[PDB]
Amino acid sequence: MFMINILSLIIPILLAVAFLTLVERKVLGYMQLRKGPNVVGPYGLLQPIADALKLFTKEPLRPATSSISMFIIAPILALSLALTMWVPLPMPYPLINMNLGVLFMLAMSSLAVYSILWSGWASNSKYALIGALRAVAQTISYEVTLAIILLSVLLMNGSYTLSTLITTQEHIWMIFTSWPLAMMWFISTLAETNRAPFDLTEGESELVSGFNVEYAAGPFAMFFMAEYANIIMMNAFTAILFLGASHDPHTPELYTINFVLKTLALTITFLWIRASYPRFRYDQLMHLLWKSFLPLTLALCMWHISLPIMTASIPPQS
């Protein structure tokens, strides 16, 4: 019966990823004065299925100079971690209830960078190596700031339990208390998901395809699925963190609908951002994260430590 819950979490996520791609293409098209997929199925609704079927019936290539074990392992790790990050999210009840769910997401997101690193290095090609090193630089840029932002926001929650965030935001959204932290968190989530304007690891215009340039067919499909699942997961995490839906214990699907709508809004905002800005330079991304975000984040961490004591507003939990 827990296996059924696992499947009911895994299969819909993959379906949403598949259709996210269609949504992504259509939104970009209409923002570019065109239509996007509207032939393969009514309103392009069968286009993701055709893409999935085409990719998995195409020949997978194993490069001659590549390291076989890491080359095959990296996409498996990417997709498995992308699926695993969903289990502690309360919608409004988590599949897995952790005392420290936030730390769990932090650690697993930190371990998801190795799929790009091992993939790029094991491809044994120059563009893949450049993509992997760009991933190293990206993580060095965003990690500390993201962690300190998370700590500063959760100081008003009282714990690292994700469900408690629903109780914290029963009357007001946390974005009205920490909007300066919310903006930096949103930018850091763009940087963490390798999304425009921070898509340096792929860098199509600069690096052809980046870390996955040598991947074809099914493994490439899994890398794409992992990336889009990460998009949806991170936006759901942001919606839980800063826009708390009201929960009725006898009426939980109201919370589920509200949370899904907020997550879709944030994902559509991601797609909107991709269509509006030029790409950063990765040294410029590091300088942005270390010279602007880091000092403000440190100051706001001090402020959000002092404020609950200042006003006698410390949250309940130990």
Partner: protein
């Protein structure tokens, strides 16, 4: 005896054609934006202060229930 017919501009001329850059201001002042931001922050701080004090009281009540049940 047909007269000459050729693609020509209309008598007089064509209407004027704009070419100068047109980028309006379309914004508020910095003071106003900062004021709205700080006002939102203060309202949020007040609401969370009340909610967290109530939460502390509720936790004390729960702990008292546990204490009464412990023996």
């Amino acid at each position: 005896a047909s007269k000459v017919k050729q693609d020509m501009p209309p008598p007089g001329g064509y209407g004027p054609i704009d070419y100068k850059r047109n980028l309006p201001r379309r914004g508020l002042s910095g003071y106003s934006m900062f004021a709205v931001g700080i006002g939102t922050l203060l309202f949020g701080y007040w609401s969370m202060m009340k909610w967290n004090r109530e939460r502390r009281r509720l936790q004390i009540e729960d702990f008292e229930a546990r204490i009464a049940l412990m023996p």
